[PDB]
Design a protein around this ligand. Sequence first.
Ligand code: HEM
Length: 461
Amino acid sequence: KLPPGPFPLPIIGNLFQLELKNIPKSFTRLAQRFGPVFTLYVGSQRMVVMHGYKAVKEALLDYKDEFSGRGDLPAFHAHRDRGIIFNNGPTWKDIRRFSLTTLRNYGQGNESRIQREAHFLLEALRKTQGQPFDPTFLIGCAPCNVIADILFRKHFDYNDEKFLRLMYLFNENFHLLSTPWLQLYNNFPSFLHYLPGSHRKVIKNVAEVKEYVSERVKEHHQSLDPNCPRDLTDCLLVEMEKEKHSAERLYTMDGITVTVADLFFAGTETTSTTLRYGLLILMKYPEIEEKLHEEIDRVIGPSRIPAIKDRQEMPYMDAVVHEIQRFITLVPSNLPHEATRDTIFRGYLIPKGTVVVPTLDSVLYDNQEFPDPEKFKPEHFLNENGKFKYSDYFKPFSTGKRVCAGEGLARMELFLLLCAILQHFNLKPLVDPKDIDLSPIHIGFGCIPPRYKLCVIPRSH
Ligand code: HEM
């Protein structure tokens, strides 16, 4: 039979068992009642939820081909079954694989690219002149430009209009997709798609991001030189000129825009948010910032640009960089998976096409691995001798068949960037540390941090 679960109602299914402002909290609640694997009908879509590390691991790692489907996500129909993030189609495996190699090869690697970005990041910060600013569209430019170098060999000035416009759309999409109305819509799309509302803005934003990618792509083709891949959208293009004679093609001008649109969005927004969350966290705990400042100076000093080698001798920072990703559970319910095959899991039948949800928050806040998981504590990642302590539970990028395609870059960005920033600036907040409320203001697709301002105070002059 199916995993156990509350008894669904006609039409709405299990919707009264779900707080829409906070699906993950409902999941945790249902997990107290029914254990680590359970069934939910939301609207008429059947859903199995895995909660806790044993169940989440097994699902992601033991059943790595039965659960490598991508659950549907209506707001993103313009990407469905193409690109990487949202194809559940035939076409995902190789587009993904190829995309992975290409990033590795552009990884003049990832450390220079990031390091060179840092120079413009630090400049923009200098330019705020210790006045109050909203960092959301200052610090975001940096992962935006890095992904944009790989993708288009393009580099944007920190206030070129289309630049700001792109980031803005990424940011609105991640925000909106974390709101109640978008959770309902994503599960009741036919009932709700032609009513007014928030879903339309997301759809219009998705389309707009595609148009801008689309053009960059037509432009790349119209001056393509197969001896010279200038970037990643080149390498995909080349891969399409190869197989033009074949009856089975898996590359489409539309497919390539999706692929790139995907990498652009994902490569910009999760990293931006995490950094922006970090700055708010470090500002709540001035003593943690302080320990950080003295460690940078000791190991790197006020001048020399940070570099990945510096990590293995910076155990506090490495602990902090991880604890920020653990504490915030940025994509708390993972992205949805679905069953490719009628599957048996702990003796339960999971019917093909069942959406499968390997919960990440429930792993990152394991009471056992991370005593006081609700509290931000770098020692969650320090052994009793002050050294870095790794955890099998550090899973904010998921794992297995659909693991983030960007994990390496992401992790490199968080450490070098958070290193740069702190090397040159003191963070300072416009309210007491005592008063910063770290709670996300929406929870769905993502965990979204409160809007805030800060000042950055130079350390070198
Ligand atoms: C802190 C930053 C990031 C976090 C927390 C994050 C997290 C995730 C998560 C949870 C998933 C879905 C996992 C699954 O389905 O099993 C994912 C998928 C993905 N990520 Fe990220 N990601 C981040 C940064 C990036 C970056 C920088 C890129 C681009 C270089 C990227 C590209 C993707 C893509 C294309 C997928 C789709 C996976 C697939 O279906 O094949 N992500 N990421």
